[PDB]
Design a protein around this ligand. Sequence first.
Ligand SMILES: [Mg+2]
Ligand SMILES: [Mg+2]
Ligand SMILES: [Mg+2]
Ligand SMILES: [Mg+2]
Ligand SMILES: [Mg+2]
Ligand SMILES: [Mg+2]
Ligand SMILES: [Mg+2]
Ligand SMILES: [Mg+2]
Ligand SMILES: [Mg+2]
Ligand SMILES: [Mg+2]
Ligand SMILES: [Mg+2]
Ligand SMILES: [Mg+2]
Ligand SMILES: [Mg+2]
Ligand SMILES: [Mg+2]
Ligand SMILES: [Mg+2]
Ligand SMILES: [Mg+2]
Ligand SMILES: [Mg+2]
Ligand SMILES: [Mg+2]
Ligand SMILES: [Mg+2]
Ligand SMILES: [Mg+2]
Ligand SMILES: [Mg+2]
Ligand SMILES: [Mg+2]
Ligand SMILES: [Mg+2]
Ligand SMILES: [Mg+2]
Ligand SMILES: [Mg+2]
Ligand SMILES: [Mg+2]
Ligand SMILES: [Mg+2]
Ligand SMILES: [Mg+2]
Ligand SMILES: [Mg+2]
Ligand SMILES: [Mg+2]
Ligand SMILES: [Mg+2]
Ligand SMILES: [Mg+2]
Ligand SMILES: [Mg+2]
Ligand SMILES: [Mg+2]
Ligand SMILES: [Mg+2]
Ligand SMILES: [Mg+2]
Ligand SMILES: [Mg+2]
Ligand SMILES: [Mg+2]
Ligand SMILES: [Mg+2]
Ligand SMILES: [Mg+2]
Ligand SMILES: [Mg+2]
Ligand SMILES: [Mg+2]
Ligand SMILES: [Mg+2]
Ligand SMILES: [Mg+2]
Ligand SMILES: [Mg+2]
Ligand SMILES: [Mg+2]
Ligand SMILES: [Mg+2]
Ligand SMILES: [Mg+2]
Ligand SMILES: [Mg+2]
Ligand SMILES: [Mg+2]
Ligand SMILES: [Mg+2]
Ligand SMILES: [Mg+2]
Ligand SMILES: [Mg+2]
Ligand SMILES: [Mg+2]
Ligand SMILES: [Mg+2]
Ligand SMILES: [Mg+2]
Ligand SMILES: [Mg+2]
Ligand SMILES: [Mg+2]
Ligand SMILES: [Mg+2]
Ligand SMILES: [Mg+2]
Ligand SMILES: [Mg+2]
Ligand SMILES: [Mg+2]
Ligand SMILES: [Mg+2]
Ligand SMILES: [Mg+2]
Ligand SMILES: [Mg+2]
Ligand SMILES: [Mg+2]
Ligand SMILES: [Mg+2]
Ligand SMILES: [Mg+2]
Ligand SMILES: [Mg+2]
Ligand SMILES: [Mg+2]
Ligand SMILES: [Mg+2]
Ligand SMILES: [Mg+2]
Ligand SMILES: [Mg+2]
Ligand SMILES: [Mg+2]
Ligand SMILES: [Mg+2]
Ligand SMILES: [Mg+2]
Ligand SMILES: [Mg+2]
Ligand SMILES: [Mg+2]
Ligand SMILES: [Mg+2]
Ligand SMILES: [Mg+2]
Ligand SMILES: [Mg+2]
Ligand SMILES: [Mg+2]
Ligand SMILES: [Mg+2]
Ligand SMILES: [Mg+2]
Ligand SMILES: [Mg+2]
Ligand SMILES: [Mg+2]
Ligand SMILES: [Mg+2]
Ligand SMILES: [Mg+2]
Ligand SMILES: [Mg+2]
Lengths: 274, 44
Amino acid sequence: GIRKYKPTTPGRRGSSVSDFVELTRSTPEKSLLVAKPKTGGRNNTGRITTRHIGGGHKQAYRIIDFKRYDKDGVPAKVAHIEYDPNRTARIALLHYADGEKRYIIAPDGVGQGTVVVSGPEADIKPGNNLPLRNIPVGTTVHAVELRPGGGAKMGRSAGASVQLVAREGKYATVRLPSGEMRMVDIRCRATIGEVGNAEQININWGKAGRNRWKGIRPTVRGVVMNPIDHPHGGGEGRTSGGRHPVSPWGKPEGRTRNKKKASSRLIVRRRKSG
Amino acid sequence: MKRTFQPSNRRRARNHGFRSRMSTRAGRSILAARRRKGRVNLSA
RNA sequence: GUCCGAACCCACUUCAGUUGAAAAUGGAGGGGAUGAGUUGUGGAUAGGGGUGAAAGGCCAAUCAAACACCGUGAUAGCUGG
RNA sequence: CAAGGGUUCCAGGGUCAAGUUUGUCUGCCCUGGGUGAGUCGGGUCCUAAGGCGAGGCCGACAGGCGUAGUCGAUGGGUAACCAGUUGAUAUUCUGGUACCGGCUUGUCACCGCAAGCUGCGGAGGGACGCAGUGAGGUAGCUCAUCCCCGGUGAUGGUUGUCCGGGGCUAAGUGUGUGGACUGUCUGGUAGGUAAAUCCGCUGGGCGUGAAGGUUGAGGCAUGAUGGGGAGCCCAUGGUUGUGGGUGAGUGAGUGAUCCUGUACUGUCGAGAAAAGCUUCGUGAGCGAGGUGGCGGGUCCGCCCGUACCCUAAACCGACACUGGUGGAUAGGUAGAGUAUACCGAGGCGAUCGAGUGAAUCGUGGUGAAGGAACUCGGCAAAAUGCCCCCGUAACUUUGGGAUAAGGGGGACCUGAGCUGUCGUGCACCCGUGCGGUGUGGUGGCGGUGAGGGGCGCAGAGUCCAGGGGGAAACGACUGUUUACCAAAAACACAGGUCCGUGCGAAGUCGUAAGACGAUGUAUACGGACUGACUCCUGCCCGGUGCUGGAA
RNA sequence: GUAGCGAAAUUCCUUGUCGGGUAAGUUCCGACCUGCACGAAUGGAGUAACGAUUUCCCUACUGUCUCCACCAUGAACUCGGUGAAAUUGCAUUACGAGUAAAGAUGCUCGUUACGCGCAGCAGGACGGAAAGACCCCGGGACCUUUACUAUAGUUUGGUAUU
Ligand SMILES: [Mg+2]
Ligand SMILES: [Mg+2]
Ligand SMILES: [Mg+2]
Ligand SMILES: [Mg+2]
Ligand SMILES: [Mg+2]
Ligand SMILES: [Mg+2]
Ligand SMILES: [Mg+2]
Ligand SMILES: [Mg+2]
Ligand SMILES: [Mg+2]
Ligand SMILES: [Mg+2]
Ligand SMILES: [Mg+2]
Ligand SMILES: [Mg+2]
Ligand SMILES: [Mg+2]
Ligand SMILES: [Mg+2]
Ligand SMILES: [Mg+2]
Ligand SMILES: [Mg+2]
Ligand SMILES: [Mg+2]
Ligand SMILES: [Mg+2]
Ligand SMILES: [Mg+2]
Ligand SMILES: [Mg+2]
Ligand SMILES: [Mg+2]
Ligand SMILES: [Mg+2]
Ligand SMILES: [Mg+2]
Ligand SMILES: [Mg+2]
Ligand SMILES: [Mg+2]
Ligand SMILES: [Mg+2]
Ligand SMILES: [Mg+2]
Ligand SMILES: [Mg+2]
Ligand SMILES: [Mg+2]
Ligand SMILES: [Mg+2]
Ligand SMILES: [Mg+2]
Ligand SMILES: [Mg+2]
Ligand SMILES: [Mg+2]
Ligand SMILES: [Mg+2]
Ligand SMILES: [Mg+2]
Ligand SMILES: [Mg+2]
Ligand SMILES: [Mg+2]
Ligand SMILES: [Mg+2]
Ligand SMILES: [Mg+2]
Ligand SMILES: [Mg+2]
Ligand SMILES: [Mg+2]
Ligand SMILES: [Mg+2]
Ligand SMILES: [Mg+2]
Ligand SMILES: [Mg+2]
Ligand SMILES: [Mg+2]
Ligand SMILES: [Mg+2]
Ligand SMILES: [Mg+2]
Ligand SMILES: [Mg+2]
Ligand SMILES: [Mg+2]
Ligand SMILES: [Mg+2]
Ligand SMILES: [Mg+2]
Ligand SMILES: [Mg+2]
Ligand SMILES: [Mg+2]
Ligand SMILES: [Mg+2]
Ligand SMILES: [Mg+2]
Ligand SMILES: [Mg+2]
Ligand SMILES: [Mg+2]
Ligand SMILES: [Mg+2]
Ligand SMILES: [Mg+2]
Ligand SMILES: [Mg+2]
Ligand SMILES: [Mg+2]
Ligand SMILES: [Mg+2]
Ligand SMILES: [Mg+2]
Ligand SMILES: [Mg+2]
Ligand SMILES: [Mg+2]
Ligand SMILES: [Mg+2]
Ligand SMILES: [Mg+2]
Ligand SMILES: [Mg+2]
Ligand SMILES: [Mg+2]
Ligand SMILES: [Mg+2]
Ligand SMILES: [Mg+2]
Ligand SMILES: [Mg+2]
Ligand SMILES: [Mg+2]
Ligand SMILES: [Mg+2]
Ligand SMILES: [Mg+2]
Ligand SMILES: [Mg+2]
Ligand SMILES: [Mg+2]
Ligand SMILES: [Mg+2]
Ligand SMILES: [Mg+2]
Ligand SMILES: [Mg+2]
Ligand SMILES: [Mg+2]
Ligand SMILES: [Mg+2]
Ligand SMILES: [Mg+2]
Ligand SMILES: [Mg+2]
Ligand SMILES: [Mg+2]
Ligand SMILES: [Mg+2]
Ligand SMILES: [Mg+2]
Ligand SMILES: [Mg+2]
Ligand SMILES: [Mg+2]
């Protein structure tokens, strides 16, 4: 759930945290960890290519099994549910029934003890990985591949969910968490259920230092810059950009997806609007 | 106060040493030009 | 990213200094002082470029485009000789 | 000590220059000398960030990136301590006592498609955050009637504990106290790049309800009949050290920033790598019927640094410059304190002086009566200030406001009882041969003290150390910023909304490959604006932009 | 131009008007609405806590002041040692009233004035320092845009690959 902080200090007034009640373990599995040095948003040219990245807590990376199809037919017991600093979701540590241990994204309602399995003949239960051909139409899935064998790509963050709406032909039409209807090969894999930790979007970080130690550097509005720095910069006193809003590089707002892209497998656009 | 020159021999050798100059054609031409002038010190 | 307060980091006021003890400090107070803290060692980003909690700020003691050398003995309807 | 410097170090000779003066002196000049490592810090070992990078990919050329690899500490690993000695070196030399790796050797025991050695990897291990409290110790420190060495005091007293001083020893080895860890015997096996008997995952049987085994804070024993530690001898030579002469080694109080301890507890922001190391095989070779292991004995153990300065007169500042410069040790009394005051260990008297009641400038001090009348402005200063007890407003987001405000006490002498700890002993469980557990103690030491009393102008008597309250504007807050005239109302912020993005994402650096985004996946990422919180955020799509459409 | 706010970090007139605070208040706080020229995420109105922010008031306190006096110190002063600097056309370098490139040590007419030092003060030497930074003129740089001309990028189709 969410534990609200008492306003003993400013910056702590309206803030809230997770209660970490799903976590059955406070430590990770050592064999599935790798070092993850920070980048600072810096290229291999050494230049800042993504702004507002820097510092934060040191984090080790947990190797997540995004394929799941190389252990078809080998049942796995959910040994633990634990914290992953690298994602907003919790991760389930699975003990496969042959000695291998792996990490997956913990689905909603999968607790310590549920036996999961992969394969075409797998049961339709949360935590089971199946090809979309062997998944009934209307099932809520997550960790959905885009092309067969490629690994899980869509529906991976906390509370994320993909709905299988149709299977007419070689393509299965699925509804992505953005509201975009899409077609993917029926040979693409997906895990049954939705992603857990769905209540984490309601956390109030309450405090600049909490975003500072999540690795986020401060963002300066382009309107309080100088004209050499931003197209919105300049002016006596407070202004707007003095023009239609643009990026720091002068790009006007508007659709940026390439229309010549070979993804003619798009049924309806996401339609965010408001 | 703190001044501009804070000596570090490791950093000095990594920045201006002979092998650093040899690593690039600009540094090689710098060494050639210092040979042409006649410097008794070609690098740091 | 609690409070008072040393080390430490800073620099609000005032006095002095202003051919200084010092090309930015000293005395007296002052702010932060478990944090978005501070610091050593090595490293990365380079000039129409970097970096910037954004002052056109900083990039080796004068940056609205560093420094060095070269074009070059630039050009000056201007000043001087 | 590090960095940095580089001979400045020591000895002798010197006084042109340097030294803000003089100088017989010197960090200066000249001559000579001085730095000793199997164990300390680096390499010979390992990797982080990052660099380079066989092939390769990308790019008119120049070049960019990167695989296999190879470097790269600020980190991991790795065997030694005490004392002594020089003018100058000392975990380096010397004495004593250790440890580590090789080579060889006496000896014991065991192997043998099937020894071993080396490569090659698997696994375990190394291996990791932050904050906090308590316990058991030890270092240190204090006191002492106890023990040793000395003194009997220029001036009233000072032969009883009155006065001063000292009350010490390492690494290593053994023991195993507190503390900590840990069931036992077999079976199977989609995994661990080749395999595994070493690991992982599972199944049984037995199993106290703890008992053994393993380890090792400190203590003890050894190391140590050794080493260190004052004043007294025919005489030393009279600013010096030699042979005797070393004497003591206890007890209590307090007590860490050190150890147990990577413990334990809490916690979200979820906290390197690789090698050494243990074991398991065998994707390589070597290798013979030779080897590996255990007490014992020989010899071998490399390269670089080592002087000296180092919160500085030797480094960065042009200076022998009131500046800057990372780490370690850091005692006593008062004190909460690493503040401040005075002292210790130790080191200094500062690199022009001598005078002189001029004005004046700087730096401090005091001040009648008044008390902001000063001034742009209470600028500056004064007042306040500490601990304990009492008491505390509007408003509030219930946390605050708050040390609100405003009141009382404090130091000294004496002191009933109340306590922490130890103690010779009274009994008592004793597994005694353990390094003990529980009631139990004339007394010592420490903490605290109701009550009574003394003195002064004054008892937080010194140094140290908030003035307080009321109201408005802005920003919610903590933070950030114009190095060197602006610290703010500016920036950021947590929160909000809009737009873009379906993943080779969008966006950005780049000619490109690539890369960051992100080993992330729409509860995510990027851009824009607004900026806690509360109540709200109205009308207009004409213009321009954006999105869609196409007669 | 709604809610809300309004002589406001916005109000020219303006010290608007009325009230409070003072003996006296161009500031301040509360209103009014006549908004030169507020206004709802360049957010509107509020807001506990916070602020070396800005503003007004009360109290305490004082050398801030009425109105200064005294004390000690580092300079200043004297002696011995050592020993600069900026600046400098000159020089045996007065004052008044004039005159002059219109503000004179230097010219005129007068007045005053023995030579040389030491400590002081700052009225002048249009004092020194800096080829004025304000203003104009010539040149430059950087910034902006529906200035011009280009161009990277983005996009349209044709053609080659096909
Ligand atoms: Mg961003
Ligand atoms: Mg992350
Ligand atoms: Mg600005
Ligand atoms: Mg622009
Ligand atoms: Mg404006
Ligand atoms: Mg704080
Ligand atoms: Mg504070
Ligand atoms: Mg600053
Ligand atoms: Mg570098
Ligand atoms: Mg500006
Ligand atoms: Mg500079
Ligand atoms: Mg310029
Ligand atoms: Mg230019
Ligand atoms: Mg030319
Ligand atoms: Mg040396
Ligand atoms: Mg010499
Ligand atoms: Mg010398
Ligand atoms: Mg010497
Ligand atoms: Mg000498
Ligand atoms: Mg001299
Ligand atoms: Mg001499
Ligand atoms: Mg590397
Ligand atoms: Mg090549
Ligand atoms: Mg190396
Ligand atoms: Mg090191
Ligand atoms: Mg020495
Ligand atoms: Mg020694
Ligand atoms: Mg020896
Ligand atoms: Mg391993
Ligand atoms: Mg392992
Ligand atoms: Mg780990
Ligand atoms: Mg203790
Ligand atoms: Mg004693
Ligand atoms: Mg006598
Ligand atoms: Mg295998
Ligand atoms: Mg196996
Ligand atoms: Mg030495
Ligand atoms: Mg100095
Ligand atoms: Mg020193
Ligand atoms: Mg120097
Ligand atoms: Mg410092
Ligand atoms: Mg002390
Ligand atoms: Mg002190
Ligand atoms: Mg001493
Ligand atoms: Mg000294
Ligand atoms: Mg002096
Ligand atoms: Mg002297
Ligand atoms: Mg001197
Ligand atoms: Mg008096
Ligand atoms: Mg008075
Ligand atoms: Mg009085
Ligand atoms: Mg009064
Ligand atoms: Mg007045
Ligand atoms: Mg007044
Ligand atoms: Mg007046
Ligand atoms: Mg003041
Ligand atoms: Mg004061
Ligand atoms: Mg009070
Ligand atoms: Mg009493
Ligand atoms: Mg009192
Ligand atoms: Mg006002
Ligand atoms: Mg108001
Ligand atoms: Mg603020
Ligand atoms: Mg602040
Ligand atoms: Mg400034
Ligand atoms: Mg300032
Ligand atoms: Mg935000
Ligand atoms: Mg793209
Ligand atoms: Mg990437
Ligand atoms: Mg917008
Ligand atoms: Mg704003
Ligand atoms: Mg605002
Ligand atoms: Mg006005
Ligand atoms: Mg008025
Ligand atoms: Mg009035
Ligand atoms: Mg609106
Ligand atoms: Mg406005
Ligand atoms: Mg608006
Ligand atoms: Mg307010
Ligand atoms: Mg003199
Ligand atoms: Mg005239
Ligand atoms: Mg005249
Ligand atoms: Mg004449
Ligand atoms: Mg004179
Ligand atoms: Mg003067
Ligand atoms: Mg002048
Ligand atoms: Mg001029
Ligand atoms: Mg121009
Ligand atoms: Mg085309």
